[PDB]
Every structure is written in structure tokens, then in C-alpha cells.
Amino acid sequence: DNFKYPLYSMVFSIVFMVGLITNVAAMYIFMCSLKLRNETTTYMMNLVVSDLLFVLTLPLRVFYFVQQNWPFGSLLCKLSVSLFYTNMYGSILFLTCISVDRFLAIVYPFRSRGLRTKRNAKIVCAAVWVLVLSGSLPTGFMLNSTNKLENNSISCFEWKSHLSKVVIFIETVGFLIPLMLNVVCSAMVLQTLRRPNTVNIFEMLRIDNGLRLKIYKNTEGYYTIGIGHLLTKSPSLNAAKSELDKAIGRNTNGVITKDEAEKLFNQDVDAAVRGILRNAKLKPVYDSLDAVRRAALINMVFQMGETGVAGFTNSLRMLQQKRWDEAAVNLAKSRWYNQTPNRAKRVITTFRTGTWDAYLNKKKILRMIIVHLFIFCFCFIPYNVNLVFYSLVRTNTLKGCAAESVVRTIYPIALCIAVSNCCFDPIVYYFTSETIQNSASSEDLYFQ
């Protein structure tokens, strides 16, 4: 079994160097940049920790193979086996949670707003840590110990019929349920990319401004509902409630569906478009722009009003002249841009590109799903199918040399592949971060 013992020493040494540097660099990047960026970032940071702890155990394993001796304590022994199963199963769940979080953010951005938050992500992370550590530390602690010889040779190392039954369970739900969950989420995310007109001016305004289905107080102190639709200027909320019933008609008692908010938004948009056409400065620009760039134009108007948008005389003239890049540069330096830089950057980019990529880049989502699926499948499918057959071959398959020897031959290969997760995890973080939405809906000072 020469494939088994020295190959570990090679892979682990390489993996340790690759894994340590990339994961330390990834961890450092996570802390400082963007200030606790997202809920998705919380899942990624827990993944780095599990990989780091397992990476730190790699040199001791290596040493144990090159020197055929374990000069370390009995505690370090079970840690090496425990942290391997810890890191693997924690990695599966964390990657699945990442895939579930992105599936929610893309397919249900409106409905899953309350599900995904930094508070709830941490609880899930604690739940993954609880299961994984409670499963891995006990088994590792009592099944592997130093005193296999400890007489000028220390080892740090049937029940298989009894113990393969529990292996099948944890491998069945701990691995197959996440794998199938990742396929489904990834599959449904791709189905929505096929759907036409995925993003429109209403969805664009929801991203930039926010959608509130209960009566709320404006930045100017006025009473509004939906996306920037104000009911009354009077400081009496009892009067404001009655005004909403006139428009909705159904004795709302202060709350409305998103469809009602869509309906009011369309009324707002039509009046805003009329307001653009009546104003003499905007009408030439508006008639020159296509439907995408007209939506960005109305976006600006929603934030500042037509009179405020008219102030960008320099930039509008260049938008009218089809000088997109130039116009994007002038818009990039303004008082508007400083207060709301994410909203402005996304509006500016649509002006510059004429596409909704800034609000929803389908090419970025496609890369994430592909990378996430193949890394997850390739890293973990080989190890876990071989472990199921290992348990089956130990008892049920019984097909002989070809059964027992083939499965045993593949086991070190699939393990080394599975140990390569810490090297491939950074790549997942990068492409998943490219899909993260910079701006959001609540806690923002300035919303209309």
C-alpha cells in the first residue's frame, strides 16, 4: 500500500503551505475590508477557521510519516483525527449554507429579506459548529490514542460491523442531503437567470431605495409607503392612514402587498416621467436615452427631484451626446455621489453601460454556481462514495479482491482530493463575493 503512506506526506506538505497562506490571507481580507460586509461573509469566515485548525494539524501528520514516530501528546493524537472529520463535514455544511444564502438572495430577494441577516447566520454557524464538534470530538477522542505501542515506537492510532452502520447514517444525511440541496438551489438560481425581464425599474428602485410595505417616516419627515410614495405632508399619522385607503381602497390598516406597492410605484413613475417631460432641461436628454438609461434617469429624479437633476447641466449634455464614459466620470464627482455611493455607482454604471449588470450580473452568478458546484462535488463526492462502499465492502458487497482492493486503492486518492478543500475554498469566496449586493434596504440614513 505504498500509494497510501508517502503520498499523504507529499500532499499534506504542499496543502499545508498552500492552505495556510491562502486562508490566512483570506481571513485578514475578511476582517478589514467593507466592515463586516454581509451575512454571506459570516459563513465564509467560519469556513476559514475550520480549515486553518486542520491545516495546523497537517505538519504533525507529515512528521509522523517521515519519522514513523509521534513524539506529541495524547491530546494532539485524537485532535488530528477529530479535526480532519471536523473540517470536512463543517466544510460541507458551510458551503451548503453559502449556496442556500445565495439561492435566497437571488430567487427570493423580497421574501427572504427577514430570513438572511447577520444575527441568523451566526446562529446557523453555531449550529454547524455544535453538530460537527459534538460528532467529531467524542469519536476522535475515544477511538484514537497514543498507547498503541509507546515502547520505543509511538503510534497515535471487529467493531467495523457495528461502526459502519453509524458511518452510513452520518455519510447519508451529513453529505447526500447537502449535495442534493446544493444541486437544487444552484439549479433554481439558473432557472431564474433564464427567465426574461428579470430586472426592471421597479426592482432597480427596490435595490437602491428599499421597499417598505408598512407606513413609514421619510427622510424629510413626511409619511410615505412603498417605494418613495408619500401619503400626506401633515404630521398626523391618523390622517395619513386615511389617505392611503383612498388610493388602495381596501381599509388597509397601514399594510399593503408588494403588488399594491408596485401599482403605486407605477403611478409615481408615470407622474415622474410627465414631470421630466414638462421640465425643459430634461426632456431633450430623456428623449435621447434608451429605456434602460431612462430608468437610471428616473432613478436620479426619484432621489432629488427633476429640479435637482437639472443641476447636472454638464453631465446631461454629455449623456445627450452619447459620451457615456465621459458622463459617468462627471457624475462620479458630486454631492449626490458622496451620500449614496453604492446607489450612485450602480445608477452611473447603467448610464455608462446601458445594461442591468450593475443590479444583476448574470455572468457573475453563472461563474459562482459553476465554480461552487464543481469544487463541492469534485472535492467531496469521491471521498464519501468510497467511504460508503468501504462500509458496504466490509460487510455486504463481498465481491472479493476487485471489491475490497479497488475500494481500498481509491480511499487515499479520494481523501487527498478531499483534503484539498482548504486550497480550493478561497476561490469559492472570490466568485461568491462577486455576486454580493453592495447596497441594501434598511438602516440607511437617506431613503426617499
What is the secondary structure of 294-315 as a DSSP string?
HHHHHHHHHHHHHHHHTT-HHH
Method: X-ray
> Cα(343)–Cα(207) distance, rounded to whole angstroms?
8
Q: Do both 371 and 407 map to the same domain? A: yes
| Last-in-domain residue among 336, 358, 380 | 358
List Cα–Cα distances, 134 to 137, 140, 162, 333, 368, in angstroms.
Answer: 6, 10, 20, 54, 31
Q: Sheet holding 223-226: strands in order across?
A: 212-217, 223-226, 229-232
Q: Which helix (H) or strand (E) holds 156?
A: none
344 lies in the same domain as 223: yes
Residue 379's domain is classified under what CATH number?
A: 1.20.1070.10
State how far the Cα of 284 lies from the Cα of 412, in Å rounded to an integer. 70
Contact yes or no for 228/236 (Cβ under 8 A) = no
Cβ count near 41 (within 10 Å):
19
Set of cell numbers at residue 399:
465481491
206 with 315, same domain?
yes
192 and 212 in a single domain? The answer is no
Query: Does residue 154 sit in the same domain as residue 73?
Result: yes
In a domain, 164, yes or no: yes
Q: Dig out the grid coordinates for 375 from the structure.
A: 469544487
All residues at 6 or more sequence positions from 78 whose CB lies less than 8 Å from its CB, including other chains: 137, 140, 141, 142, 143, 144, 145
210 sits in which H/E element: none
Specify the DSSP element, H or E, that contains 405. helix 401-419
**What's the domain count of the chain?**
2
Q: At what angle do helices 362-395 and 421-433 cross, to 10 degrees?
A: 150
133 and 276 fall within a common domain:
no
264 CA to centre of own chain: 32
Indicate whether 441 belongs to any domain: no
Are 257 and 367 contained in the same domain? no
> For residue 345, how many C-alpha atoms fall within 13 Å in the half-sphere facing its CB?
9
Three-state DSSP state, 213: strand
d(CA 233, CA 235): 7
Strand 223-226 and strand 229-232: pairing?
A: antiparallel
C-beta of residue 182 within 8 angstroms of C-beta of residue 372? yes
CB half-sphere exposure, 283, CA atoms < 13 A: 6
- Tell me whether residue 440 is in a domain: no
Long-range contacts formed by 362-371: CB under 8 A, 24+ apart: 362/193, 362/198, 364/431, 364/434, 364/435, 365/106, 365/189, 365/193, 365/435, 366/190, 366/193, 367/431, 367/434, 368/102, 368/431, 368/432, 368/434, 368/435, 369/186, 369/189, 369/190, 371/427, 371/428, 371/431
Three-class SS state of 191: helix
Distance CA 62, CA 11 (A): 9
Alpha helices in 249-361 (DSSP H): 258-278, 282-288, 291-309, 313-320, 324-331, 335-339, 341-353
Scan for cell 390622517, then name that residue.
Answer: 239
Helix (H) or strand (E) holding 34: none
Burial class of 316 by CB neighbour count within 10 A (0 to 12, 13 to 18, 19+): buried
CA dist 84 and 51 (Å) reads: 9
- Which residue, 358, 381, 403, sits at the end of a domain? 358
CA dihedral 58, 62, 64, 66 (to 10 degrees): -170
Q: How far apart are CA 286 and CA 273, in angstroms?
A: 9
Q: Which region, left, alpha or beta, applies to residue 200 given φ > 0 means left and ψ of -120 to 50 means alpha?
A: beta
Query: What does residue 323 show for φ and ψ, rounded to 5 degrees?
Result: -95, 75
What is the CATH classification number for the domain harbouring 319?
1.10.530.40
CA distance 381 to 235: 62
Domain end (from 307, 327, 358): 358
| Distant-in-sequence, close-in-space partners of 327: CB < 8 Å, separation ≥ 6 | 315, 316, 318, 319, 351, 352
Residue 66 parent element (H or E):
helix 39-66
In a domain, residue 99? The reply is yes
Q: How many Å separate Cα 218 from the centre of its chain?
A: 31
Report resolution in angstroms.
3.2
Range of the domain at 422: 5-196+361-433
